[PDB]
Amino acid sequence: STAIFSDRYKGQRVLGKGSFGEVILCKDKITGQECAVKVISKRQVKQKTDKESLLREVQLLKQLDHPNIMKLYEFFEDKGYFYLVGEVYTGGELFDEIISRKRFSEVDAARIIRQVLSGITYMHKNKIVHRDLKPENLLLESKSKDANIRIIDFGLSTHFEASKKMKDKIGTAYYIAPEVLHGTYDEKCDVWSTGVILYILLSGCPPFNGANEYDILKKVEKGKYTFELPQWKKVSESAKDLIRKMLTYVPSMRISARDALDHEWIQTYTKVPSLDNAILNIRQFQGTQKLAQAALLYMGSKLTSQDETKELTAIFHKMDKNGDGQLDRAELIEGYKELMRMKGQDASMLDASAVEHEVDQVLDAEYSEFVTVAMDRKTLLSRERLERAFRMFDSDNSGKISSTELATIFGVSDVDSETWKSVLSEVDKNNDGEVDFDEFQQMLLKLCGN
Numbered sequence: 328s329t330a331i332f333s334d335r336y337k338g339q340r341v342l343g344k345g346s347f348g349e350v351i352l353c354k355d356k357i358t359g360q361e362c363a364v365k366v367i368s369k370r371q372v373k374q375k376t377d378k379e380s381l382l383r384e385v386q387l388l389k390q391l392d393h394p395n396i397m398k399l400y401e402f403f404e405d406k407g408y409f410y411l412v413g414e415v416y417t418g419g420e421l422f423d424e425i426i427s428r429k430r431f432s433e434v435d436a437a438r439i440i441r442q443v444l445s446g447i448t449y450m451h452k453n454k455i456v457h458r459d460l461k462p463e464n465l466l467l468e469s470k471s472k473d474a475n476i477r478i479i480d481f482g483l484s485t486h487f488e489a490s491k492k493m494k495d496k497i498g499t500a501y502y503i504a505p506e507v508l509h510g511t512y513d514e515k516c517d518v519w520s521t522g523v524i525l526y527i528l529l530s531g532c533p534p535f536n537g538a539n540e541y542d543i544l545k546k547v548e549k550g551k552y553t554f555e556l557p558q559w560k561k562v563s564e565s566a567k568d569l570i571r572k573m574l575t576y577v578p579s580m581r582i583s584a585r586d587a588l589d590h591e592w593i594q595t596y597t598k599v600p601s602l603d604n605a606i607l608n609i610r611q612f613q614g615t616q617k618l619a620q621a622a623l624l625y626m627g628s629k630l631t632s633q634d635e636t637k638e639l640t641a642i643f644h645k646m647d648k649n650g651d652g653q654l655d656r657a658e659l660i661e662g663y664k665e666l667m668r669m670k671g672q673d674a675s676m677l678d679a680s681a682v683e684h685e686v687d688q689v690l691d692a693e694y695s696e697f698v699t700v701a702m703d704r705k706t707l708l709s710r711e712r713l714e715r716a717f718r719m720f721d722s723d724n725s726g727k728i729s730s731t732e733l734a735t736i737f738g739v740s741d742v743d744s745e746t747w748k749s750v751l752s753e754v755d756k757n758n759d760g761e762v763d764f765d766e767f768q769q770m771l772l773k774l775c776g777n
């Protein structure tokens with residue numbers, strides 16, 4: 328009767344981290360349908376609404392259908408979790424595709440924004456507000472050239488409370504409407520976020536920027552911005568006009584999603600030089616955000632693995648009723664499973680069969696040795712991604728990040744200026760204003776108490 332998620336679906340692999348929880352690629356055990364499952368930890372994420380309100384929103388979301396909005400198929404609830412089962416998209420984030428292009432024009436910017444507005448307009452007709460629209464919530468349907476955009480996370484912000492941790496709110500500040508900051512907001516907040524996104528498409532720079540999260544919000548709240556950057560001289564007047572209307576401070580004076588679809592700009596440019604400088608700035612901006620994000624996730628994984636190594640060792644020690652330092656495969660599974668009850672982070676192993684497979688992957692690579700391998704398996708996933716993000720950021724292949732650049736990266740990561748300079752002095756007392764990768768990594772290690 329009360330159907331169980333894992334009776335119907337098996338996890339195949341991880342798709343990554345989104346807002347409110349992790350996303351797993353899953354497969355229906357009978358029909359073979361692939362789906363993306365977002366798993367929200369009730370312990371980690373507080374609800375803003377009562378159960379019956381969430382159920383009703385979900386029943387509505389399942390019935391809604393639009394080409395630029397993620398399809399939701401199913402919803403489950405158990406003791407500790409919510410499972411949102413939707414269509415899986417394989418084209419990745421819009422901005423990562425954009426930075427892979429040789430050229431990008433207003434026609435490309437217009438076709439992108441028409442799609443977002445068209446998705447937004449439909450959802451507003453149905454009384455659903457996103458609130459947290461940003462490039463990271465804009466997925467490409469597949470790898471194809473003319474790939475449709477699919478907006479993810481519509482409706483969730485109404486029912487769940489956002490994380491206050493910086494690793495979860497990288498990038499959020501540039502896109503939030505000022506009225507959301509003060510508490511009285513409605514669907515016009517999504518037109519604002521779209522206007523900031525459009526501003527970034529045409530210039531590659533946020534209209535409201537600053538050295539850290541609070542600086543950005545101060546700029547957003549004041550609400551002022553300019554088209555005084557030289558890359559605007561190359562942009563149509565009617566595009567700015569649209570941007571001005573979408574970024575109008577008083578929401579009741581701000582243009583609707585529906586009316587923005589009928590704006591000259593959308594109408595003219597969805598039927599013409601390449602914005603070279605914009606692509607360059609977007610590429611720098613994406614590189615900066617991803618490195619900052621990878622840095623904070625690396626530090627977290629290191630603190631998590633420090634916690635869980637000590638925890639698993641004490642569990643395995645107590646289970647060592649022999650005292651001989653060794654355990655069976657059966658007991659190793661009971662202790663690994665027990666580590667998974669206490670903690671609530673492994674979305675990837677939310678089933679008894681999943682834990683047996685991870686254990687078998689570790690055994691193929693004396694509980695002490697098993698503990699090292701089981702936990703290095705967790706951290707090296709985030710460690711390899713750090714290095715990859717460092718290499719991506721270092722676009723000139725110099726091998727080094729300058730002091731100016733660290734300041735930008737640590738500003739975006741909300742690591743205090745005095746704090747990271749002190750850490751650098753401790754890694755290299757003679758440093759000459761630049762760090763290679765291993766020094767950078769050494770700094771992050773010191774910034775999470777290691």
Ligand SMILES: COc1ccc(-c2nn(CC3CCNCC3)c3ncnc(N)c23)cc1C
Binds near residue numbers: 342343345365
């Ligand atoms: C609210 O329900 C949601 C939200 C996002 C996703 C989702 N999340 N993600 C993770 C991506 C990982 C990279 N950052 C952007 C999001 C997905 N990847 C492919 N297809 C998807 N459907 C997703 C899935 C569901 C069921």
